[PDB]
Design a protein around this ligand. Structure first.
Ligand SMILES: Nc1ncnc2c1ncn2[C@@H]1O[C@H](COP(=O)(O)O)[C@@H](O)[C@H]1O
Ligand SMILES: Nc1ncnc2c1ncn2[C@@H]1O[C@H](COP(=O)(O)O)[C@@H](O)[C@H]1O
Ligand SMILES: Nc1ncnc2c1ncn2[C@@H]1O[C@H](COP(=O)(O)O)[C@@H](O)[C@H]1O
Ligand SMILES: Nc1ncnc2c1ncn2[C@@H]1O[C@H](COP(=O)(O)O)[C@@H](O)[C@H]1O
Ligand SMILES: Nc1ncnc2c1ncn2[C@@H]1O[C@H](COP(=O)(O)O)[C@@H](O)[C@H]1O
Ligand SMILES: Nc1ncnc2c1ncn2[C@@H]1O[C@H](COP(=O)(O)O)[C@@H](O)[C@H]1O
Lengths: 163, 162, 163, 162, 163, 163
């Protein structure tokens, strides 16, 4: 029938993870390029589950810890055509549109540094796919106007992403 | 793992857009995407902050739509989900702008059809969207006559095609 | 309550399939145009599940084989606002970014020529949605340096997509 | 090489967008870009076919704007130039859609300011656009007070920013 | 002061030319990739005027005639950071959005198979820039409604780009 | 009638400049955001020639040197709706696609760190437009196979933008 499995995603402090689905072996080189040409100091590991042929986890990196995190999560999800990116010295918003526009990339499941689970379906031996993710925690309530003011201030005075 | 079905209310004249993003700036960037797309668009946006205070963050120029968006976020109750309700605009008027907001990771639905969201709860307070049910299944396959009728609809009625 | 079903996706040799979610009847015409204006000589079929009103599988094609493959998969998936595209004489990378930018298109579940299953949830009679896909097979191992050299060679000497 | 200046009329309530494209499908694709961007947009589009019959090709849902666009194409008289006049929409509502039309190669201007097009004629019937003059040169540099005033304009008046 | 020069662009039957401006040496590889990954049968030459360093016309191609056309036009325009693409077996609409989205690419001056001139300004020795182009001929008149019907028919029955 | 002027563009070592055309006052804020959200630690100045009303050079920056460079160039070009961006700690390729997709931006004339001139037409007092630019220098020759190997090596071993 269908077996659901939960995969916990380790996210060390200072990293962000991006998980998606693509196709074709060139994914690995195109994602390498999207990352290194987006932010000069970026440190990353990228791994991609080739789904046919030799069926290898394909990987590039300029940081060995991040390479191994990416590889290990691909091994655990173990679903054809999934890719995993771990990054330091850059935020997902710095690279996401580049990633969306890689022609091999078909969808992105998560971009986050929160506690994160991946929900995987195994339908037959060695046939697995991503069902969804659980990105952080459910809401505790609704923000107030003063909470709104606070987050506006955060964006303007702290991270300076807005004026 | 438990699955839950969330019914999505869609008042006449509105459309809903449901997706997933990350980072608090989501709500400001989605506000701008909408307001700069269509003059006179009316909307409510709500976004599930998934860490820290874990507050539903919201922007709107219509209070009915604000509160619909907030309600649905609370019902779905999945981290980093956003909901947009719109009036005086169609999803096609705004969707490419939304896709290109850097915080936005994925869109699950854009529609006015009867709609359900399928949510997985894996543990208390840890939920995610596993799909949507957008309207109903097919009743059959269109004929050449049906084709001619939808071609005329797009050219004579809504005038989106020549 | 919720029933999960598995739909097998036929893929004749020489074809690729792209499956996604959209909305609005204009989907069919816009995807037609996206395909035909991308690659001279592309052969395709496109079907879309209109999810209200007449609830007809809507379709366009320049190849009858591919039309019927697209229509048949839509009948089997049977989920509102899902679209299916079968292509010959073009690869998904040749058309995907065009498809992504169609304003009706909201998400793409798969683009592939691998063995492929679609996981569909039926929540009540006539109410179905796509939960995920199973694209090819789980990984057999992790790429070695030697395997990386072979992948690089393939991209440079065989398909000539990299220099 | 001779240079000519073409004055561009801009009626109150309109904006003009001038660029360069190629291939007859330009006009249909620009029509669709506009009509699917903003409900109730009013427009005229004209495009200079630069071979074959060399006819100005045009689409519109407003006759005043159609004819303005046609007139300007004739005055510029440069192969593969297009002109769009719009009402009930702003250029920012439609420009990204226009940029992404595959026939469109470049955009010279989007504005309601007084505007001139600079055209080079190299030989009879062989002309091209060499630039535009969009409004007037700067009178000075804004102060912090001026800054605060434009920030308030964008947040309190047009509400494009928070 | 400023010297204006007119460069005539040869366009052999069955080719199209794309002329633009970019920056950075990676332009040449990224444009190669944009072209070869857009249309399977595409034949092309691409040349780019490196504007500093060794200041070479940089080039890639899978067709030697087109390579030489591209190189020769770069030599004649002789303006820093200009690029030239000649293509067969594909139309500009098949590749243009990919080209626009190459991060090195800053503008496109022309995409056409019409009689074409490039207007170049030389301001000082070996300092040249593109002022504009003359793409085909000035209009002879305004199309009628029946002319409109004819071009609609062309798009629907002949090239089949619209329905 | 028409006077042509040549504006020299100062480019301190470590900076790049991007010059373009936009419209509407929101240009300044949207370009600010495009820059700051692209690369952590980017330093920039952005100036824009408001072309009606008060006709003020509008500006935003996180670095006073770069602000004044941007403002000064706008004063010298002195053409309505032109924008200038100077950046440190980021390359144009890191930000260009974001800039291209700002809805106010209509065209980009240059992105470079080379010697650069802007050609401005003055058609009457206070009425100026950008005609073109002269980005670096004319080519000295055509790339040999040996030169191509060196270019490839540079991209793979030095800047690591290609594999
Ligand atoms: N300054 C920032 N810039 C860009 N993205 C951020 C920033 N801070 C947090 N994020 C992203 O937004 C998510 C939620 O924010 P946080 O409140 O830090 O848990 C993080 O997991 C990051 O993926
Ligand atoms: N005129 C229109 N323009 C754009 N989108 C539309 C229009 N009419 C319907 N839609 C969208 O397409 C979906 C299906 O349409 P309907 O067949 O009218 O139920 C709706 O729920 C809307 O999201
Ligand atoms: N030469 C190619 N160009 C583009 N896409 C390809 C190519 N070869 C394979 N693919 C795609 O990548 C997927 C996996 O490749 P394969 O290893 O050939 O089974 C296929 O299912 C195709 O969708
Ligand atoms: N069937 C076509 N598909 C795509 N582009 C075309 C086609 N025919 C012509 N073009 C382009 O449109 C331009 C003008 O068309 P023509 O009427 O063939 O001179 C040509 O120079 C080509 O660049
Ligand atoms: N509210 C607005 N929304 C979008 N664009 C605008 C708006 N107001 C003015 N513009 C554009 O910006 C240009 C400069 O504005 P103004 O200062 O009002 O002359 C105009 O010619 C319009 O093209
Ligand atoms: N490492 C790099 N990454 C990105 N862009 C660069 C890099 N090096 C040079 N550039 C850009 O390409 C242009 C020409 O390069 P150069 O050969 O270094 O003078 C410069 O003016 C920069 O704008």
């Amino acid at each position: 029938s269908i077996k659901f499995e939960l995969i916990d995603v380790p996210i060390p402090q200072g990293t962000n993870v991006i998980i998606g689905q693509a196709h074709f072996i060139k994914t690995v080189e195109d994602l390498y390029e999207a990352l290194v040409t987006s932010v000069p100091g970026v440190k990353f590991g990228i791994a991609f589950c080739e789904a046919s042929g030799k069926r290898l986890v394909r990987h590039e990196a300029n940081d060995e810890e991040l390479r191994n995190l990416a590889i290990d999560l691909c091994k655990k999800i173990a679903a054809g055509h999934v890719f995993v990116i771990y990054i330091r010295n850059a935020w997902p918003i710095n690279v996401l549109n580049a990633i969306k526009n890689v022609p091999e990339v078909v969808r992105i499941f998560a971009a986050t540094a929160n506690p994160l689970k991946v929900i995987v379906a195994e339908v037959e031996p060695e046939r697995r796919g991503v069902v969804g993710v659980v990105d952080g925690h459910s809401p505790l309530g609704v923000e107030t106007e003063k909470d709104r003011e606070e987050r506006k201030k955060f964006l303007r005075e702290v991270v300076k992403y807005k004026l």
